[PDB]
Design a protein around this nucleic acid. Structure first.
Ligand code: MG
Ligand code: MG
Ligand code: ZN
Ligand code: ZN
Ligand code: ZN
Lengths: 327, 259, 276, 276, 259, 327
DNA sequence: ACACACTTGACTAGGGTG
DNA sequence: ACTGTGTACTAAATTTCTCTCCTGG
DNA sequence: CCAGGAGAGAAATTTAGTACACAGATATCCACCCTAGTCAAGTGTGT
DNA sequence: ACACACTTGACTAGGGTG
DNA sequence: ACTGTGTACTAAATTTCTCTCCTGG
DNA sequence: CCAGGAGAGAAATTTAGTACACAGATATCCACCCTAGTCAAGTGTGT
């Protein structure tokens, strides 16, 4: 069964809706596989048809497409794993993404069809362990959040919920990075002076986050977050003073030395105005962590007599650090 | 093909079923030719020179390996003066990409003023590694050893092949047809994923357009144009104006209105 | 007819015939059956084929080899360009062996990308048996342009000119620096620091992102109806038009005419002149 | 810096500058301070000085000498044309010595009509002292063109093309007839039976009737102000632009200018790349 | 100039004062160098072949002379077969003009079909003379004797001349710088006076125009055009549009509207 | 004294009108010749100024130019002769001709300024003996007659007056040919059927004209007139039969043989319909003029067995001329 | 058992396209 | 002191007309 | 019953807008690769 | 009267533009 | 079986703005 | 007393519209005319 011809959107909403039969595909495909391949070919035609023309996307289908979405993948996952039916979910995805950024998508119409419980029935999918879908899900969320406002701040609160529930105990959510990137896209798109809510929820949970362990799996992107955080918001750097320092680890580990590698790659936007009050509490740990039990601190604690301007800072306003720096 | 693309390049177990082989057709392909300074995203580099088991003369090859993705670009020379390391870097930089923080040990080819007289010209913070700092060896040497292996897996067969194609092919496989972790991304894919556009606040829109373009010249006549409506593609070359025939084409194009 | 045989004795312009006293339309008829008066004026109104290639996908490449800097060292370079996204890979030193060309292609694949078609000139370093044995060892087609037609490779020919006069710029200045790197530099430029038209992308980044896109298709070429037309031998032997009786097999931009040697040939329309 | 001198290390385009984050127009200033980028990109935006003389009522002949197909023997044709009514007089048989060129002029003057100026190229048969003495003996001027510049005589060079392909037409048909009277034929059908152009008046008429008209006036080549131009030697020696400092005596279209030999030629503007 | 133009040309007494000599100075030019079937309006011709004083070998002057105006066109050659009696005619026709009645004599060079096989191919009534009809001789011979005496006037002085220029010059003087009778018209200007336009009745108007049309490119700029204006002149080449500067120019033009 | 500057047509009508001083130039130029050359230079400037611009020719000058004309040459001539002051009259002429065919000459205005006694004060100038002016006067009259209607038929009658007064006696008018050409231009520009007036005044005076002698001085042009007369009007040939025949000369003379040369060059438009009634009265003189006293009639009267169609006419309808043609 | 009936070969020559 | 140009060739406008056959005089 | 008349060819007939090539001319060399012929080393017969 | 001082020339040589 | 093209260079539109300084709230 | 506001630069900054040249490469010949020197017939010294 296939077509391209009367050129009636009704016969095409038929082609769309007629996928309303659903396969149970855990281990039993033997019963008439052909409905499966024909479905794949159907959606193939559907996608390049949407690329074909302009007037294809009128109202009578909007809640149907969003329903066909929900019916096609809105279900649980078993809490490095991939999908048997993968190229099928990989096509419902690519079809939806192209559907979203299609030119003729008017938001004022879809506003009632975009739903808050819907998007909650979307974000909980990031907990899965397929990286591939965890990509399509990344990009699609980035398009929604770029294309709506109410749900924009709504999801902001929803994720802060997840944040809380995650950091305070041992959630192996294993799908965090994809939001840390949607975050970075946001924290770039700002203009201060503004509401403190953002920076507040950062000093609330973002930095306390480092109480967490296994940091290798989310360290780079969070570092790129904190730097996208500072620029220009960076004058908001005065209160960052000692935050990680109190959240400093206690035992001997390459965790600590990775966090050193971090701290080494963050002293970049210093400005001497408030830098008066911080060079001392800086050295109150940096010059005072030689007592660490690593065998590396022998050249760890002394990586700052070597920069261009960090050294010139050691010779800029040294009227207060001069006796403390070991002669 | 997959048994031949193997014998052509000697990949392993993972990245072959994505060309059409089943599970066991990958393990049996292994049974064929049996037993044969943080993460710093993007561009904060690192590099090194290496010797190499000769064919009869020890080839000295430099290399530059990224630290975020894990790509590699390198070459082989006979002499190792500063003019050499210079030509090596500069080639890798015409390969991808253009860095801003380069690191190395303190060999003589890294000291010379001409080298400085080139680094400074490119706004490139040239730091110094701590010489004999093998805490980064397990990863650089992970790469280098990869090369060493692959090369010997090449010229242990058909040794008459010249000692350069072995390098070319070695790369083209090591940088388009592998993933180590579950990232399911080749080094070279990852290293050039167009970065996600950062969303601005309070203007939740986009701009993807150029409106007509009076079009003509599908075929064989000069006349008035046709009103050329949107272009859903674009490239040096043509632009995919959707013809009113409900069909598509490619033409080098006439007008440019505002959008 | 004093109108007609007058033209058949002087070959005067139609306007003169009109003033002799015959209506325009009959004049226009006369001036398209004076076969000599047709075989001599070279005027060439067939429609241009601007059709270097379609590029639905990426990866239909193009090859060409060139001589540089013969002050003392002829400096032979090979270039391959891609014609979806105008990206250039270029490796010289001196030689011409098949084995050299092969080593160059094999190197360009390490740069981007890994093609699926190819086409170059007639060849010799490309016509080698072992060359095509390398091709077939990589599951790649291969094609050759019509002989003796330089514009056929218009794209590359232009990208050559772009590359030479960038080198020349550098070598006016800084006239000591070795070519190995003054080339590596001129490449990093051509690829990363320029834009083309309102396309307004850098060739490279255009060559990277959009492959996320699908591929339209147009196939099943049809509607073949011959014609008849005298023009010209394409051996640059420019002269009076060369008249053939008629096309053995039509094509799209090209044609196919039996030279009197009863031999097939593929003349491009930029060399033909229609008849009855 | 990175904006400013980057061009001074790669010579990238202005767009690349602004997009790396430079300014919007001081870019344009930068791209006119790379003597290299000027000595290399070729372009002649200098205006198309394109003009003959001819204001007179049909009294500047402008006539050159040329060759012809050999049935088994070359045939030299001398041809002089007018410049206000395109009338053509042409006399050939084999020889291109001075004394014959002289006898040609002396014949093509009987056929209308005695001139007042004349123009030609540097051909030897014209540089002859004897030709010159004949000319002066007849109260005529005489002039040459800058050497090595064929377009200079565009008009006559074209009326040549016209005459050849008319001959070829005849000799396609009736290929026995004697190779001289078929010239007197072509000369008829070129002067009497062929409407020229939009003017719509056969050359012959256009050449006779309007002599009743007066002469308008225009004078005062004046208002000299020099400039500087680096462009190219005009000895077909196409290469990078050839830069001098600067004009001594500018004139209409052309421009006097000294080469390093402290010698002065008149480079036609069509080879000058302006830079002040 | 008049004494040199005299000896160079050297016709006669009448048409020289129109160059600047007075009455008596014209007669003192004569004192100088001590050596000095109907009327058939245009194109009903007549012709003849003539012998000549052998300088050492006599040449065959072969001439055609109009009957309305009195112009001349002839040439020199050795043989007298219809081959070249043709080539002579044909050349005279490339000279002026194209006739309709050719009467010369009953000579064999006129008898041959090669002749008529050309005449008929030109729609040329051939009306030929009654042989030995000298009632027309005193006039055609007046012309021929002019040619004779002029030639000997040329080369008796300076016998170094070839026998082509002597004829060329002989013509150019006999057909531009003479007036026969009081008509005060040269043979040429008479033979090519553009005929007076015949006047229509009840259409008593005129059409001397080509519609206004835009113009650019006097000088050195490309932009929109200007005007338009009428154009009061025209020629292969330019068209003399009166520029808005209350002055005139010459440009190879742009448009041609209707008027 | 000279100019080109305020650009006021009043200062240019001044330049024009200031030629109002007039030279008596019979034999006495000694008194201040310079006014003469300056006048010549003045009109030279005036002429090329009229070629210069468009708006130059407004009303206030029209009767002035026509007056300046009349004052400059409307005077008697001494009844092969040329003019001493010739290049002056040759310039007032060329200026006026170019003035006439100037584009911006509106006839509806000049209609009141064109005058019938004026044109009579123009035509009587053709009696002069300068050929040069007899040319400018030709062409200018041809422009007038082409550019007006009332005076058109008026002058037609005026010339028929001259015709009468000329032919009937021995007027040595010596300036006829120039009108015979203006005639031919007219007789071409016709469309019959029409008023017989024209053809009537032709059978009235035009052919009776041949009673005149010395015909060589106007014979060609009159022959061209009679042929322009016939074509196509020539079916109007029926009545021409015998006209010259009765006007045939009487004595022996090359006048008669010239008239033979004429009659030989007029048998060109025969058509056999009315040609029935004329081939006989034709031969009633042609075959019957052997009795002429010339020595030439021996081959004069037999130049008609030799044509293409005249001979075919002798073999077309010979059922009536057969015994008369001498066997 | 070695002289000849039988092969390659190498190795020119020549041609064709850029 | 000095400088490109004229014709051929084909699609498209545009302008005649032209019978079809409608209309109320 | 039919003079102006939309009007669909239609036909006809003008106009508009690009391409081409006149220029002094050929021979000769060069880097490469393929096919076709020509002496120069190798192996089975007869008694 | 037979020893040398004075032109062309002829006659080479070479170059420049088409 | 097979087919020209991309950049440089300058005048001209056109679109920011911009003080001048007028106006009646 | 001064915010919108013609408005004349103005400045700035975009766009439009043609030209150019990448192609395998030189040497060698030819028709002609001019300028510059080189012995070779013709004529001037010393008696
Ligand atoms: Mg090539
Ligand atoms: Mg020449
Ligand atoms: Zn293997
Ligand atoms: Zn023809
Ligand atoms: Zn530059």
């Amino acid at each position: 069964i296939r077509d391209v011809p009367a050129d009636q959107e009704k016969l095409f909403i038929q082609k769309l809706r007629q996928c309303c039969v659903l396969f149970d595909f855990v281990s039993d495909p033997l019963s008439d596989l052909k409905w499966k391949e024909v479905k794949r070919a159907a959606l193939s035609e559907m996608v390049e048809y949407i690329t074909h023309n302009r007037n294809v996307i009128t109202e009578p289908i909007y809640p149907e497409v969003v329903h066909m979405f929900a019916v096609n993948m809105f279900r649980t996952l078993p809490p490095p794993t991939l999908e048997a039916a993968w190229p099928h979910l990989q096509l419902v995805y690519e079809f939806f993404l192209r559907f979203l950024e299609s030119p003729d998508f008017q938001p004022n119409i879809a506003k009632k069809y975009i739903d808050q419980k819907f998007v909650l029935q979307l974000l909980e999918l990031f907990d899965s362990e397929d990286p591939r879908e965890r990509d399509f899900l990344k990009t699609t969320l980035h398009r929604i959040y770029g294309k709506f406002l109410g749900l924009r701040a709504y999801i902001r609160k929803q994720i802060n919920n997840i944040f809380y529930r995650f950091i305070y105990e041992t959630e192996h959510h294993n799908g965090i990075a994809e939001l840390l990137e949607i975050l970075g896209s946001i924290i770039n798109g700002f203009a201060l002076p503004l509401k403190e809510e953002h920076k507040i929820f950062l000093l609330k949970v973002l930095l306390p986050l480092h109480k967490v362990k296994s940091l290798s799996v989310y360290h780079p992107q969070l570092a790129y977050c904190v730097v996208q955080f500072l620029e220009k918001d960076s004058t908001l750097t005065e209160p960052v003073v000692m935050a990680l320092l109190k959240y400093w680890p206690k035992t001997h580990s390459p965790k600590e030395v990775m966090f050193l590698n971090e701290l080494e790659e963050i002293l970049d936007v210093i400005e001497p105005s408030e830098f008066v009050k911080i060079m001392e509490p800086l050295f109150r740990q940096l010059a005072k962590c030689v007592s660490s039990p690593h065998f590396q601190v022998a050249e760890r604690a002394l990586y700052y007599w070597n920069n261009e301007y960090i050294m010139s800072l050691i010779s800029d306003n040294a009227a207060k650090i001069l006796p403390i720096m070991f002669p | 093909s997959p048994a031949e693309l193997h014998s052509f390049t000697h990949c392993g177990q993972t990245a072959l079923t994505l060309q059409g082989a089943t599970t066991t057709e990958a393990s049996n392909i292994l049974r064929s030719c049996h037993a044969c300074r943080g993460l710093l995203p993007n561009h904060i580099w690192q590099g090194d020179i290496t010797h190499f088991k000769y064919k009869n003369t020890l080839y000295r090859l430099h290399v530059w390996v990224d630290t975020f993705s894990g790509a590699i670009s390198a070459t082989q020379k006979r002499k190792e003066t500063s003019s050499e390391a210079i030509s090596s870097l500069l080639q890798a930089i015409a390969y991808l990409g253009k860095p801003s923080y380069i690191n190395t040990d303190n060999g003589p080819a890294y000291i010379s003023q001409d080298f400085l007289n080139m680094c400074t010209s490119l706004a490139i913070r040239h730091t110094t590694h701590v010489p004999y700092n093998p805490t980064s060896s397990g990863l650089v040497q992970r790469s280098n050893g990869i090369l060493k292996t692959l090369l010997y897996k090449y010229f242990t067969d058909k040794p008459d092949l010249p000692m350069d194609n072995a390098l070319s092919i070695a790369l083209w496989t090591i940088n388009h047809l592998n993933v180590l972790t579950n990232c399911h991304k080749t080094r070279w894919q990852l290293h050039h994923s167009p970065r996600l556009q950062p969303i601005p606040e309070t203007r939740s829109l986009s701009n993807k357009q150029t409106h007509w373009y009076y079009f003509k010249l599908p075929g064989l006549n000069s006349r008035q144009w046709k009103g050329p409506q949107e272009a859903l593609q674009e490239a040096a070359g043509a632009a995919l104006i959707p013809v009113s025939a409900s069909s598509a084409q490619w033409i080098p194009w006439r007008l440019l209105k505002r959008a």
